[PDB]
Amino acid sequence: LFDFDTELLRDESLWKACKPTAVYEKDGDICVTVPFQKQLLANDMVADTAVPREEYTLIIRQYNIGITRLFLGFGEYEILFTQDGTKRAVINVEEPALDRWSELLPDPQETLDITLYPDGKREIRLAAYDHFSPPRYDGLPIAFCKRTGKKERATLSFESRPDECFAGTGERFFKMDLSGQTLFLKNQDGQGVNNRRTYKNIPFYLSSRMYGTFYHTCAHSKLSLAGHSTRSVQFLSDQAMLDAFVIAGDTMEEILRGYRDLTGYPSMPPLWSFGVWMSRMTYFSADEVNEICDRMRAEHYPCDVIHLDTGWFRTDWLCEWKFNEERFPAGTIDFTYPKATEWYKGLLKQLLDMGVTCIKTDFGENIHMDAVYKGMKPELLNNLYALLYQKAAYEITKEVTGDGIVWARAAWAGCQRYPLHWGGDSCSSWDGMAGSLKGGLHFGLSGFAFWSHDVPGFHTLPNFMNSIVAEDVYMRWTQFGVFTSHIRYHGTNKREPWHYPAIAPLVKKWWKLRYSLIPYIIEQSKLAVESGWPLLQALILHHPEDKLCWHIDDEYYFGNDFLVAPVMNSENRRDIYLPEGQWVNFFTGERLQGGRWLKEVYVPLEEMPVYVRENAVIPIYPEEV
Numbered sequence: 001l002f003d004f005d006t007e008l009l010r011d012e013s014l015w016k017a018c019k020p021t022a023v024y025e026k027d028g029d030i031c032v033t034v035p036f037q038k039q040l041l042a043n044d045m046v047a048d049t050a051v052p053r054e055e056y057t058l059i060i061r062q063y064n065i066g067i068t069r070l071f072l073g074f075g076e077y078e079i080l081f082t083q084d085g086t087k088r089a090v091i092n093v094e095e096p097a098l099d100r101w102s103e104l105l106p107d108p109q110e111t112l113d114i115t116l117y118p119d120g121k122r123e124i125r126l127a128a129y130d131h132f133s134p135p136r137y138d139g140l141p142i143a144f145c146k147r148t149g150k151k152e153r154a155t156l157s158f159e160s161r162p163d164e165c166f167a168g169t170g171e172r173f174f175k176m177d178l179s180g181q182t183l184f185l186k187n188q189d190g191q192g193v194n195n196r197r198t199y200k201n202i203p204f205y206l207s208s209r210m211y212g213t214f215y216h217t218c219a220h221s222k223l224s225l226a227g228h229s230t231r232s233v234q235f236l237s238d239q240a241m242l243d244a245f246v247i248a249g250d251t252m253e254e255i256l257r258g259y260r261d262l263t264g265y266p267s268m269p270p271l272w273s274f275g276v277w278m279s280r281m282t283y284f285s286a287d288e289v290n291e292i293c294d295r296m297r298a299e300h301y302p303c304d305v306i307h308l309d310t311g312w313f314r315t316d317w318l319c320e321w322k323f324n325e326e327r328f329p330a331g332t333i334d335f336t337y338p339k340a341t342e343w344y345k346g347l348l349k350q351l352l353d354m355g356v357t358c359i360k361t362d363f364g365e366n367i368h369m370d371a372v373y374k375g376m377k378p379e380l381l382n383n384l385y386a387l388l389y390q391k392a393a394y395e396i397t398k399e400v401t402g403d404g405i406v407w408a409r410a411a412w413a414g415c416q417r418y419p420l421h422w423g424g425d426s427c428s429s430w431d432g433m434a435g436s437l438k439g440g441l442h443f444g445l446s447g448f449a450f451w452s453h454d455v456p457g458f459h460t461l462p463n464f465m466n467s468i469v470a471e472d473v474y475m476r477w478t479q480f481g482v483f484t485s486h487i488r489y490h491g492t493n494k495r496e497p498w499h500y501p502a503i504a505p506l507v508k509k510w511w512k513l514r515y516s517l518i519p520y521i522i523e524q525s526k527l528a529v530e531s532g533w534p535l536l537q538a539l540i541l542h543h544p545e546d547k548l549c550w551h552i553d554d555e556y557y558f559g560n561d562f563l564v565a566p567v568m569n570s571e572n573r574r575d576i577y578l579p580e581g582q583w584v585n586f587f588t589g590e591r592l593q594g595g596r597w598l599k600e601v602y603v604p605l606e607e608m609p610v611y612v613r614e615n616a617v618i619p620i621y622p623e624e625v
Contacts, residue, residue: 001182001222001236002145002153004043011148013048014040016140017112020091021055031080032059033091035112037144045135047109058112058142062088065258066119070244074144074151077241086120092128108134112141119248122211127157127232139232144240151240156215158233164209165550166225166233167538170202170411171423171451172442173435176538176553178205182227186220187365187383187410193426193435199365200411200421201383202446204259205233208540208550212255214262216243218384218412238379252445252541257532259447264417266449267404268529269486272357273420274518275304276511277488280495282311286326292496301497302511302625307360307407307490321347329354332368335388336375345396352400359397364389364410386410394418411448420450420486428457428469428491433477433568438553440484444534444541449525451536452486459492469493471503472570472605478507479608480566482514483558485525485535506606512624519619524559535559543579546595552577561618562586563611567603574609575599582614 002014018036025031038053040046061069062082068089071078080089092113108131115125130139145153165177173193174181188197203215205225215221219239226233235244245262249255260266278296283289289306296303310317312324323329334340348359364386369378376384390408394417398404408421415421423439426432433456440451456477460467481487489495497504525535533541537557539549555565555577563583565576576598583592587607591614592598603609612618 001224001228001234002140002143002155004145008043011146013042013146014045015054015144015146016040016047016109017142018053018110019094020058020112023091028061029083030059030061031089032057033114034058035142037142039146045137060089062118065261066248067258067262068116068118068246068248070116070156070242070246072142072154072242074154074240074242076151082120088117088120090115105133114141116246117248118211118246119250122209122246122248124207124209124211124246125159127159127229127234130157130159130229130232138229139234142242152238154237154240154242156235156242156244158213160207160226160231160233161209162230164207164226166208167206167540167550168202168204168212168442168446169223169225170198170204170443170446171200171421171439172198173439174442175438176441176540176551178442179226180230182222182224184221185215185223185383187386187412189363189365190424192432193424193439194431199409199424199439200386200415200443200446202411203235203413204446206252206255206445207233208544210249210252210255210544212247212249212259214245214247214259214413216245216413217241218387219380220383252544253532255532256445256447256534260416260532263414263447266416266419266529268526269405269419269450270357270401270403271518271522272304273405273486274521276302276514277305277307277486277490278303278495279305279307279309279488279490281490281492282309282316284311284316284324284326286328295498296496299498299508300624301508302515305358305488307488309360309490321351323351329356332371334373334375335385335392336373336381340374341388341392345392348393348396349400352397357401357403358405358407359393360407361390361393362409364408383412386412387414390415390418413447416446416448420452421448422486422488423451423453425458426454428460428473428477430473430568430570432457433473433480433566434554437480437556437566437568440536441538441553441556444536445538447532449528449534450485451534452484452488453481454490455481455488455495458490465492467493469500471500474500475503475506475510475605476567476569476608478510480564480568482510482517483562483564483608483610485521487514503605515625516620516622517618519621520559520561523619527560533560539579546579548577549579561612561616563609565609567608572605573600573602576601576609578611583611584614584616586610586612 015037020033020035022034036053039048039051041048111128113128126141127139128141131137185201190197219237222236224234247258394406423436426436436453456474497507543549580595
């Protein structure tokens with residue numbers, strides 16, 4: 001992960017952390033440890049003694065709600081008791097003796113051993129002994145690198161057990177458990193929803209040992225979640241600055257709730273945002289949209305939003321507000337330039353004055369890395385950009401609208417303040433459906449509340465723009481879509497129901513359901529905006545002590561009372577795991593026993609597997625609209 005070598009003739013060196021040469025407080029009741037960091041002799045791995053060792057201060061800060069902030073500015077930036085003790089950490093009193101009968105191998109170098117007990121009952125400690133013989137280290141608890149005198153690539157590592165499982169890190173399109181994945185925490189255009197290119201990175205993971213870690217960074221980063229070492233969660237930042245928040249909890253919702261405490265809570269999206277969104281890449285004419293609008297109503301298709309994409313300008317994908325020749329209704333922007341921000345806020349201001357109520361803040365995963373911005377260096381602004389980017393259009397939108405709403409595709413830590421964020425460009429296939437769902441689940445487990453996805457998948461295969469969607473996929477995504485925070489029909493080709501007969505009747509009945517459930521969605525979200533919960537919730541948020549659930553990415557909770565296990569098949573059959581509970585089918589009130597498997601269940605095309613708890617009480621609008 002520390003990398004390094006090409007072909008191993010670069011001015012670069014690694015500086016390992018050692019036993020603290022002093023520990024003290026504070027003076028803010030924040031203990032500060034000064035560990036020596038000595039260079040190693042250029043891989044791998046012996047100590048280089050021609051060069052002295054460099055001390056830096058590890059200041060540790062405890063917080064009112066079971067959070068422990070590890071910090072180490074290096075240069076550059078800026079037993080343990082809780083006045084109640086309640087211990088919170090233990091730096092190691094060494095003397096690791098011993099016995100001795102050789103010989104072949106020398107004593108290992110000294111390492112920085114610390115354990116952390118945020119809630120006084122956790123047990124997350126630094127990977128201070130992840131090595132073989134002294135020449136072979138597959139993990140470093142703390143360490144950094146120099147590149148031609150320039151300091152960089154600081155690394156923090158924790159220990160993990162064999163059976164530990166992880167989640168979060170943003171909208172990661174992989175399975176429930178990420179326990180061999182080394183992640184490039186670096187936002188990218190995914191160009192699909194089934195690979196490692198990731199639209200929304202977040203320096204945050206959850207653990208089955210029931211803690212979280214927020215890495216307060218916005219530099220390009222690596223996060224091996226037991227990927228390289230089978231014993232280590234390893235973080236890497238290019239920045240040479242460690243600021244790690246360690247969040248304990250007794251429920252997963254506690255941990256997420258504290259994450260929000262640190263980085264902001266989501267606002268409540270407006271009521272109109274919860275109705276269905278029709279869209280396409282792209283409409284052009286006004287009469288084009290008018291005909292569609294007028295007919296959904298005529299046909300009684302309960303729809304709330306029409307979106308206008310890459311084609312309401314003079315020329316399609318050529319943005320410039322302006323707004324085409326339909327009459328009535330290159331360079332990156334420097335959001336570190338508190339002026340250009342008012343200018344971009346200026347552009348949105350015209351559009352908002354007209355009647356538009358939301359803005360699609362597409363892109364922002366990449367920036368012109370070969371430019372000079374009026375603030376941070378490109379290598380730092382890039383990931384933070386989705387925050388600044390979406391903050392501006394959110395802020396301005398609220399100033400005019402009175403509503404904080406943004407439709408955003410990129411994200412970083414802090415972007416959960418500004419609802420909402422959609423699943424990207426998924427493939428209209430069962431792989432995009434399942435891949436997309438993975439995304440929303442890790443996204444809900446990364447401090448967000450409101451997540452969406454293009455229905456039914458963004459693009460068809462093969463032939464991005466000209467293939468057929470397949471009613472099969474359509475209907476089963478529409479279902480999945482209804483039971484998600486936001487529902488939006490969008491993509492490369494016609495999305496309107498009347499283009500998919502024989503399903504179009506049902507699609508209409510399934511839009512009528514969406515409106516019959518708006519109240520329930522609102523009440524759950526009104527609770528979400530105030531807590532660590534998401535609308536789309538992995539089963540571990542309710543069942544963290546059930547091992548199966550840490551491996552289910554095909555089922556989920558919608559709100560607090562709804563279990564969703566979607567059919568992502570053409571064969572129209574699937575298996576469903578009911579977790580602990582007395583369960584009731586939402587469409588066929590069938591009392592389902594317990595915490596067991598429903599095997600080879602046939603689901604008709606008209607129906608999705610949906611369950612409520614025996615009892616429960618779920619709002620609904622009993623009248624069409």
